[PDB]
RNA sequence: UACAAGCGAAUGAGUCAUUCAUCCUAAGUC
RNA sequence: GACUUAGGAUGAAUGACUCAUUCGCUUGUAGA
C-alpha cells in the first residue's frame, strides 16, 4: 500500500494560529479586537442577548463577515458577526472578565466544587486553586456579553452583570417573609431570576412557581425535604421556608449546527424539574438571556474556528493573486472528507480536480516531448496523475493537519477556562502534536476508531482522505478562478508545468512544405475556419499510409481534453447529482461505440484514409447494422479505430487555435447535440439487468461460449414460478452476453417488473457458526441451486422486568426475547415456515431461525 | 431537552471480508 | 478472439465491525 483505503496511520492536528499567541498579564494593560455576535430568530421564540468574542489578532476580514444558521429544536436560528471597533481593557476589569467565564462556562457544563466527600472530606471552589493550567496558551477567547439595547449602536459590555457575577464569585470565596443568601429579593414576583446552588455546584436556570409547600412537604425513601438535606449533605434548614422553589435545570451542549433530524421522529418530552429550599439558593443579579445564550456559543465558535483554518491555507498557497480571491467558506468544504457530517463533503469537486489534473498533465507532456510516442507518454502520465504520487506532494507541503475526519462531539469542546470533566489521555507515545512519517505509525488493522481525537491532536487518516485533498483543492481553485488560477496550486505542490513552447510544433509542421483539394469538405461539416490546413489533415492518417506523421498522439491529447469538457459541463448544469451519477453520465457521452455514433451521423468518416483490408469489411458491416427510425441505432458495437476519429479533431484544433479551450467546446456542442440527461439515461443492459435481479431476489446463471468468430452466451433466470432464457450472439462475446441479457430483459419488462443434506439430491456444506455463518452458507447455497431469496418475519417483544434471561457462554442478560418464522420459497414445491426461540438479538433471531429450518429441512 | 455508564431497535455514512460487473488510457502472453 | 497485470473514476447483493442524530428500558449520581 502507498496511499490506498487500508493504511491508516496518524497525522497530527493544526491549531488556529490567529487566535492567540501570548497575553498581556505581563504588562498589566491589554487591548482587544472586539467581533459582535448578535442572534435572530425564525420563529419568535425569545430574544437571545448579544454577545463579543476578543482576541490579540484581528481576522482576515472574510471570516469577520459570515452568515450562518442553527436548527435548535424545530426553531431555526440565525446568526452573524459583523465587527465592531477595538476595546481596551484595565487590570481590574480584566480580572473580573475572567471570573464571568469561568464562572458560566463551568457552571452549565462541569463542576466547579472540586473535592470528594466520599474520597476524603475536603471540597474546593476551583477559583481559589492554582488555575492557569487550563488555559493552556494556544486557545484565548474572553466572551463577553453584550447589552443589546442600541439607539444607533451598542458596543457595551454589560458591566452589571459582570460586577454581579464578580460579587457572587468573590462571595462563594468568603462562604413579608422573604429570604436568599445574600439577597432578600421581592416576594411579589421571582420568575425568570437566575439562582446558584451553595451545597453543590450547578448553577440553576429560570426559577418560577412560588407554590404553597413548606419544607417540611411530603418528598416524591424519605418523608421531607428537611429530614433529606438533614441526611444527605447534614445541613439544618434555617428556616421554616413557608416559600419553596421550583425550577429548571440546565443540560449540556447538543450540536445546534447541522440539521440531523428536523428536516430528515424527535418526540419531546415534558421538562424535568427540581426543587430546592430558598436559603440553599444564592441570587444572581444577571439576565436570563444571556444564560440561554451560552448554549448556541460552542456550536459557533466550531464554525468561525474552522474558518480560521480555511483562511490559514489560502493565505499559504499565495505569493500573487492574478484576479483569484476566493471565498473561505470553499476552502472549508474542499478539505472536510465524507465521514464529517456535513452539507458538502468535498467528493464533487475531487470529480472535476481529477480531470483537471490529467488535462494538464496530457497537453504538457505532449508539449514538452514532440518525439515521444504515445504508448511512452500514457506511462510518464500514469506517473504524475498517480494517487500515490500525490500522497507523496501533499504530506510533504503539511496539508495534513487540516483534513477532518471528525465527528465532532461537543460535550468536550476544551474552553479556555473550563475544567474539562471528559479527558481522553494519551497513549500514541511522543508527546509533540505532529508525529513524524514511520511505519511504526502505517498500520493495516480493523477495530481501531477513525477520526477520533487524542488530547494533543493526533487521529488515524483513512490515507485516501490525504491523497484526494490535493485534487479537490485543485478543483476548488477551478470554479470560483480559471484555468490559469489552478496553475499556480499544481504550482505549489510541485507538479511540474511548462505552457509556454506551444509554438514550435505547429511552426515545424507548417515549415513541412513540399517534402512531405479534399480537405476542403471536412471543413464545411466542422464548421470551424481551421487556421492550419496540415494540421487537420495530421489528424485524419489512420496508420495505413505508413507515413511518418500518427493520429495517436492527437487522439491521447483529445480524449483528455474531451473528458475534461464533458466533466465540466455536467459540473454546471447539475448541482445535485453526487459522484456515482456524474460518473455514470460521463460514461454515457464518452462511450467508445457514441463516437463511433456520432462520426457516421455527421458524415465525416468518409474521409479517413485507410488501406486495411480488415478494417474496411467492419465499417461496411457497421454502416449497414444501422436501422430506420427517433434515431438509428447500430445492431452490432463496430470498430474503435472509426471511433477514434473524433477525439483526433478535439487535439488538432486545439493546438490550433493556441491552447484557447472555450473554442473547442464551440465547435463539439452542435456536433454532440443529443447530450445525455439523467431521466433518459440508459444503462448498459447486462449492468441493469444484475442491479435489477439483485434488488427484487431472483438470481440467474449465465454460461458463454467463445467457440469461432461466432461468439453465442446464454442466460436462465428462475422466477417464483417459471424459468426464462434468453439468446445472444456477437463477435467480442463481451458485448454480445449483454445483449441476451437485453433480450432477456425485454421479455421480462412484459410481465410488469422493472455435512448435512438437502431434501433429497442437493448437499449443503458444513455449517458455520460466529454470528454470519448459516445466514452465508444459506445464501451461497440459494446462488448455486437456483433458489429465491428467503423473507425474514419477526416478533418484537419487550419486558420491563429488570431481567430477560437467555443462557449462553455469558449469563447474557437482556430486555428484548426476539423470535422470528422465515418462510424459504422453493420452486415448484410448496412454501416452508418455521421460527426459533432465543438470543436476543435481530440477526442472531434470524440466525437461529435458519439453523432450526435447517434441522426441519433434513427430515422431508 | 438534569448528568454519566450498559443492553436493544430504526435511519444514514465509512472501512473490511467473500463473488459478480460498467467506462475510458496503456502493456504482455497464447 | 481468450487470459493476466499496471494506472485513474465507480456501482450492486449478503455478512461482521465503527461513528453520527433520535427513541424504549436498567443500575448509579455532593441531581431532586
Ligand atoms: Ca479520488
Ligand atoms: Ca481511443
Ligand atoms: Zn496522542
Same mark, same amino acid.
Given at each position: 500500500?502507498?496511499?490506498?483505503?487500508?493504511?491508516?496511520?496518524?497525522?497530527?492536528?493544526?491549531?488556529?494560529?490567529?487566535?492567540?499567541?501570548?497575553?498581556?498579564?505581563?504588562?498589566?494593560?491589554?487591548?482587544?479586537?472586539?467581533?459582535?455576535?448578535?442572534?435572530?430568530?425564525?420563529?419568535?421564540?425569545?430574544?437571545?442577548?448579544?454577545?463579543?468574542?476578543?482576541?490579540?489578532?484581528?481576522?482576515?476580514?472574510?471570516?469577520?463577515?459570515?452568515?450562518?444558521?442553527?436548527?435548535?429544536?424545530?426553531?431555526?436560528?440565525?446568526?452573524?458577526?459583523?465587527?465592531?471597533?477595538?476595546?481596551?481593557?484595565?487590570?481590574?476589569?480584566?480580572?473580573?472578565?475572567?471570573?464571568?467565564?469561568?464562572?458560566?462556562?463551568?457552571?452549565?457544563?462541569?463542576?466547579?466544587?472540586?473535592?470528594?466527600?466520599?474520597?476524603?472530606?475536603?471540597?474546593?471552589?476551583?477559583?481559589?486553586?492554582?488555575?492557569?493550567?487550563?488555559?493552556?496558551?494556544?486557545?484565548?477567547?474572553?466572551?463577553?456579553?453584550?447589552?443589546?439595547?442600541?439607539?444607533?449602536?451598542?458596543?457595551?459590555?454589560?458591566?452589571?452583570?459582570?460586577?454581579?457575577?464578580?460579587?457572587?464569585?468573590? &462571595?462563594?470565596?468568603?462562604?413579608?417573609?422573604?429570604? &436568599?443568601?445574600?439577597?432578600?429579593?421581592?416576594?411579589?414576583?421571582?420568575?425568570?431570576? *437566575?439562582?446558584?446552588?451553595?451545597?453543590?455546584?450547578?448553577?440553576?436556570?429560570?426559577?418560577?412557581?412560588? =407554590?404553597?409547600?413548606?419544607?417540611?412537604?411530603?418528598?416524591?425513601?424519605?418523608?421531607?425535604?428537611?429530614?433529606? &438535606?438533614?441526611?444527605?449533605?447534614?445541613?439544618?434548614?434555617?428556616?421554616?421556608?413557608?416559600?419553596?422553589?421550583?425550577?429548571?435545570?440546565?443540560?449540556?451542549?447538543?450540536?445546534?449546527?447541522?440539521?440531523?433530524?428536523?428536516?430528515?421522529?424527535?418526540?419531546?418530552?415534558?421538562?424535568?424539574?427540581?426543587?430546592?429550599?430558598?436559603?440553599?439558593?444564592?441570587?444572581?443579579?444577571?439576565?436570563?438571556?444571556?444564560?440561554?445564550?451560552?448554549?448556541?456559543?460552542?456550536?459557533?465558535?466550531?464554525?468561525?474556528?474552522?474558518?480560521?483554518?480555511?483562511?490559514?491555507?489560502?493565505?499559504?498557497?499565495?505569493?500573487?493573486?492574478?484576479?483569484?480571491?476566493?471565498?473561505?467558506?470553499?476552502?472549508?468544504?474542499?478539505?472536510?472528507?465524507?465521514?464529517?457530517?456535513?452539507?458538502?463533503?468535498?467528493?464533487?469537486?475531487?470529480?472535476?480536480?481529477?480531470?483537471?489534473?490529467?488535462?494538464?498533465?496530457? @497537453?504538457?507532456?505532449?508539449?514538452?516531448?514532440?518525439?515521444?510516442?504515445?504508448?511512452?507518454?500514457?506511462?510518464?502520465?500514469?506517473?504524475?496523475?498517480?494517487?500515490?504520487?500525490?500522497? %507523496?506532494?501533499?504530506?510533504?507541503?503539511?496539508?495534513?493537519?487540516?483534513?477532518?475526519?471528525?465527528?465532532?462531539?461537543?460535550?468536550?469542546?476544551?474552553?479556555?477556562?473550563?475544567? =474539562?470533566?471528559?479527558?481522553?489521555? @494519551?497513549?500514541?507515545?511522543?508527546?509533540?502534536?505532529?508525529?513524524?512519517?514511520?511505519?511504526?505509525?502505517?498500520?493495516?488493522?480493523?477495530?481501531?476508531?477513525?477520526?477520533?481525537?487524542?488530547?494533543?491532536?493526533?487521529?488515524?487518516? *483513512?490515507?485516501?482522505?490525504?491523497? $484526494?485533498?490535493?485534487?479537490?483543492?485543485?478543483?476548488?481553485? #477551478?470554479?470560483?478562478?480559471?484555468?490559469?488560477?489552478?496553475?499556480?496550486?499544481?504550482?505549489?505542490?510541485?507538479?511540474?508545468?511548462?505552457?509556454?513552447?506551444?509554438?514550435? *510544433?505547429?511552426?515545424?509542421?507548417?515549415?513541412?512544405?513540399?517534402?512531405?483539394? /479534399?480537405?476542403?469538405?471536412?471543413?464545411?461539416?466542422?464548421?470551424?475556419?481551421?487556421?492550419?490546413?496540415?494540421?487537420?489533415?495530421?489528424?485524419?492518417?489512420?496508420?495505413?499510409?505508413?507515413? =511518418? #506523421?500518427? #493520429?495517436?498522439?492527437?487522439?491521447?491529447?483529445?480524449?483528455?481534453?474531451?473528458?475534461?469538457?464533458?466533466?465540466?459541463?455536467? &459540473?454546471?448544469?447539475?448541482?445535485?447529482?453526487?459522484?456515482?451519477?456524474?460518473?455514470?453520465?460521463?460514461?454515457?457521452?464518452?462511450?467508445?461505440?457514441?463516437?463511433?455514433?456520432?462520426?457516421?451521423?455527421?458524415?465525416?468518416?468518409?474521409?479517413?484514409?485507410?488501406?486495411?483490408?480488415?478494417?474496411?469489411?467492419?465499417?461496411?458491416?457497421?454502416?449497414?447494422?444501422?436501422?430506420?427510425?427517433?434515431?438509428?441505432?447500430?445492431?452490432?458495437?463496430?470498430?474503435?479505430?472509426?471511433?477514434?476519429?473524433?477525439?483526433?479533431?478535439?487535439?488538432?484544433?486545439?493546438?490550433?487555435?493556441?491552447?484557447?479551450?472555450?473554442?473547442?467546446?464551440?465547435? +463539439?456542442?452542435?456536433?454532440?447535440?443529443?447530450?445525455?440527461?439523467?431521466?433518459?439515461?440508459?444503462?448498459?443492459?447486462?449492468?441493469?439487468?444484475?442491479?435489477?435481479?439483485?434488488?427484487?431476489?431472483?438470481?440467474?446463471?449465465?454460461?458463454?461460449?467463445?467457440?469461432?468468430?461466432?461468439?453465442?452466451?446464454?442466460?436462465?433466470?428462475?422466477?417464483?414460478?417459471?424459468?426464462?432464457?434468453? $439468446?445472444?450472439?456477437?463477435?467480442?462475446?463481451?458485448?454480445?452476453?449483454?445483449?441476451?441479457?437485453?433480450?432477456?430483459?425485454?421479455?421480462?419488462?412484459? %410481465?410488469?417488473?422493472?455435512?448435512?443434506?438437502?431434501?433429497?439430491?442437493? +448437499?449443503?456444506?458444513?455449517?458455520?457458526?460466529?454470528?454470519?455463518?448459516?445466514?452465508?452458507?444459506?445464501? /451461497?447455497?440459494?446462488?448455486?441451486?437456483?433458489?429465491?431469496?428467503?423473507?425474514?418475519?419477526?416478533?418484537?417483544?419487550?419486558?420491563?422486568?429488570?431481567?430477560?434471561?437467555?443462557?449462553?457462554?455469558?449469563?447474557?442478560?437482556?430486555?428484548?426475547?426476539?423470535?422470528?418464522?422465515?418462510?424459504?420459497?422453493?420452486?415448484?414445491?410448496?412454501?416452508?415456515? #418455521?421460527?426459533?426461540?432465543?438470543?436476543?438479538?435481530?440477526?442472531?433471531?434470524?440466525?437461529?431461525?435458519?439453523? /432450526?429450518?435447517?434441522?426441519?429441512?433434513?427430515?422431508?
Amino acid at each position: 500500500a502507498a496511499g490506498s483505503k487500508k493504511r491508516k496511520e496518524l497525522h497530527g492536528t493544526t491549531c488556529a494560529n490567529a487566535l492567540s499567541g501570548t497575553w498581556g498579564e505581563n504588562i498589566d494593560g491589554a487591548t482587544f479586537q472586539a467581533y459582535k455576535f448578535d442572534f435572530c430568530c425564525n420563529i419568535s421564540g425569545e430574544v437571545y442577548s448579544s454577545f463579543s468574542l476578543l482576541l490579540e489578532s484581528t481576522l482576515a476580514e472574510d471570516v469577520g463577515k459570515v452568515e450562518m444558521d442553527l436548527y435548535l429544536v424545530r426553531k431555526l436560528v440565525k446568526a452573524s458577526v459583523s465587527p465592531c471597533g477595538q476595546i481596551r481593557l484595565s487590570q481590574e476589569e480584566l480580572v473580573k472578565a475572567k471570573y464571568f467565564q469561568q464562572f458560566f462556562f463551568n457552571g452549565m457544563f462541569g463542576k466547579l466544587f472540586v473535592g470528594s466527600k466520599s474520597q476524603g472530606t475536603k471540597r474546593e471552589f476551583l477559583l481559589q486553586t492554582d488555575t492557569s493550567s487550563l488555559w493552556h496558551p494556544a486557545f484565548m477567547f474572553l466572551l463577553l456579553p453584550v447589552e443589546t439595547n442600541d439607539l444607533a449602536s451598542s458596543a457595551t459590555i454589560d458591566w452589571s452583570a459582570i460586577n454581579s457575577c464578580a460579587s457572587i464569585v468573590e &462571595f462563594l470565596k468568603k462562604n413579608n417573609l422573604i429570604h &436568599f443568601a445574600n439577597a432578600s429579593s421581592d416576594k411579589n414576583s421571582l420568575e425568570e431570576l *437566575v439562582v446558584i446552588a451553595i451545597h453543590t455546584g450547578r448553577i440553576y436556570s429560570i426559577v418560577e412557581a412560588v =407554590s404553597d409547600s413548606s419544607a417540611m412537604s411530603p418528598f416524591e425513601g424519605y418523608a421531607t425535604y428537611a429530614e433529606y &438535606f438533614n441526611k444527605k449533605y447534614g445541613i439544618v434548614l434555617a428556616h421554616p421556608n413557608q416559600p419553596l422553589m421550583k425550577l429548571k435545570q440546565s443540560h449540556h451542549a447538543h450540536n445546534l449546527l447541522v440539521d440531523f433530524n428536523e428536516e430528515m421522529v424527535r418526540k419531546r418530552k415534558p421538562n424535568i424539574h427540581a426543587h430546592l429550599p430558598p436559603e440553599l439558593l444564592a441570587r444572581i443579579d444577571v439576565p436570563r438571556a444571556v444564560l440561554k445564550s451560552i448554549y448556541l456559543l460552542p456550536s459557533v465558535m466550531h464554525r468561525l474556528e474552522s474558518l480560521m483554518l480555511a483562511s490559514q491555507l489560502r493565505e499559504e498557497i499565495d505569493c500573487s493573486i492574478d484576479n483569484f480571491s476566493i471565498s473561505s467558506t470553499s476552502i472549508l468544504e474542499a478539505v472536510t472528507t465524507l465521514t464529517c457530517p456535513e452539507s458538502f463533503s468535498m467528493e464533487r469537486l475531487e470529480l472535476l480536480g481529477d480531470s483537471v489534473l490529467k488535462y494538464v498533465a496530457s @497537453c504538457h507532456l505532449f508539449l514538452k516531448y514532440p518525439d515521444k510516442d504515445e504508448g511512452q507518454l500514457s506511462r510518464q502520465r500514469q506517473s504524475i496523475i498517480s494517487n500515490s504520487n500525490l500522497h %507523496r506532494l501533499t504530506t510533504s507541503r503539511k496539508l495534513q493537519g487540516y483534513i477532518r475526519n471528525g465527528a465532532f462531539e461537543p460535550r468536550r469542546w476544551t474552553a479556555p477556562g473550563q475544567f =474539562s470533566l471528559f479527558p481522553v489521555p @494519551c497513549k500514541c507515545g511522543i508527546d509533540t502534536r505532529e508525529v513524524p512519517l514511520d511505519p511504526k505509525f502505517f498500520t493495516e488493522n480493523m477495530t481501531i476508531k477513525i477520526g477520533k481525537s487524542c488530547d494533543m491532536g493526533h487521529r488515524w487518516v *483513512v490515507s485516501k482522505s490525504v491523497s $484526494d485533498c490535493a485534487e479537490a483543492l485543485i478543483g476548488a481553485y #477551478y470554479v470560483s478562478g480559471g484555468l490559469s488560477a489552478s496553475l499556480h496550486m499544481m504550482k505549489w505542490l510541485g507538479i511540474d508545468v511548462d505552457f509556454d513552447p506551444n509554438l514550435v *510544433v505547429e511552426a515545424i509542421n507548417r515549415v513541412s512544405l513540399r517534402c512531405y483539394d /479534399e480537405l476542403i469538405e471536412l471543413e464545411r461539416k466542422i464548421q470551424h475556419e481551421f487556421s492550419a490546413k496540415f494540421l487537420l489533415k495530421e489528424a485524419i492518417t489512420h496508420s495505413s499510409l505508413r507515413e =511518418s #506523421y500518427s #493520429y495517436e498522439r492527437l487522439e491521447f491529447l483529445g480524449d483528455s481534453v474531451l473528458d475534461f469538457l464533458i466533466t465540466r459541463h455536467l &459540473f454546471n448544469t447539475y448541482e445535485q447529482t453526487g459522484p456515482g451519477e456524474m460518473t455514470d453520465l460521463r460514461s454515457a457521452c464518452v462511450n467508445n461505440e457514441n463516437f463511433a455514433q456520432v462520426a457516421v451521423k455527421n458524415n465525416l468518416h468518409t474521409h479517413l484514409q485507410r488501406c486495411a483490408t480488415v478494417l474496411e469489411t467492419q465499417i461496411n458491416d457497421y454502416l449497414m447494422s444501422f436501422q430506420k427510425p427517433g434515431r438509428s441505432i447500430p445492431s452490432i458495437q463496430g470498430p474503435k479505430a472509426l471511433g477514434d476519429v473524433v477525439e483526433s479533431i478535439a487535439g488538432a484544433l486545439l493546438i490550433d487555435t493556441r491552447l484557447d479551450l472555450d473554442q473547442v467546446w464551440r465547435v +463539439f456542442e452542435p456536433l454532440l447535440s443529443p447530450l445525455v440527461t439523467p431521466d433518459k439515461l440508459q444503462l448498459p443492459p447486462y449492468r441493469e439487468l444484475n442491479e435489477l435481479c439483485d434488488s427484487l431476489g431472483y438470481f440467474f446463471r449465465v454460461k458463454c461460449s467463445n467457440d469461432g468468430v461466432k461468439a453465442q452466451a446464454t442466460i436462465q433466470l428462475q422466477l417464483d414460478d417459471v424459468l426464462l432464457t434468453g $439468446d445472444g450472439s456477437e463477435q467480442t462475446n463481451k458485448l454480445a452476453l449483454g445483449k441476451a441479457a437485453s433480450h432477456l430483459l425485454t421479455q421480462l419488462e412484459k %410481465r410488469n417488473i422493472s455435512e448435512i443434506q438437502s431434501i433429497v439430491i442437493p +448437499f449443503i456444506g458444513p455449517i458455520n457458526m460466529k454470528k454470519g455463518g448459516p445466514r452465508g452458507t444459506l445464501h /451461497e447455497f440459494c446462488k448455486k441451486h437456483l433458489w429465491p431469496m428467503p423473507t425474514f418475519d419477526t416478533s418484537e417483544e419487550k419486558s420491563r422486568t429488570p431481567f430477560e434471561f437467555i443462557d449462553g457462554g455469558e449469563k447474557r442478560t437482556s430486555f428484548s426475547s426476539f423470535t422470528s418464522t422465515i418462510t424459504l420459497r422453493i420452486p415448484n414445491r410448496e412454501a416452508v415456515m #418455521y421460527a426459533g426461540e432465543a438470543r436476543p438479538d435481530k440477526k442472531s433471531s434470524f440466525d437461529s431461525a435458519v439453523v /432450526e429450518l435447517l434441522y426441519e429441512l433434513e427430515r422431508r
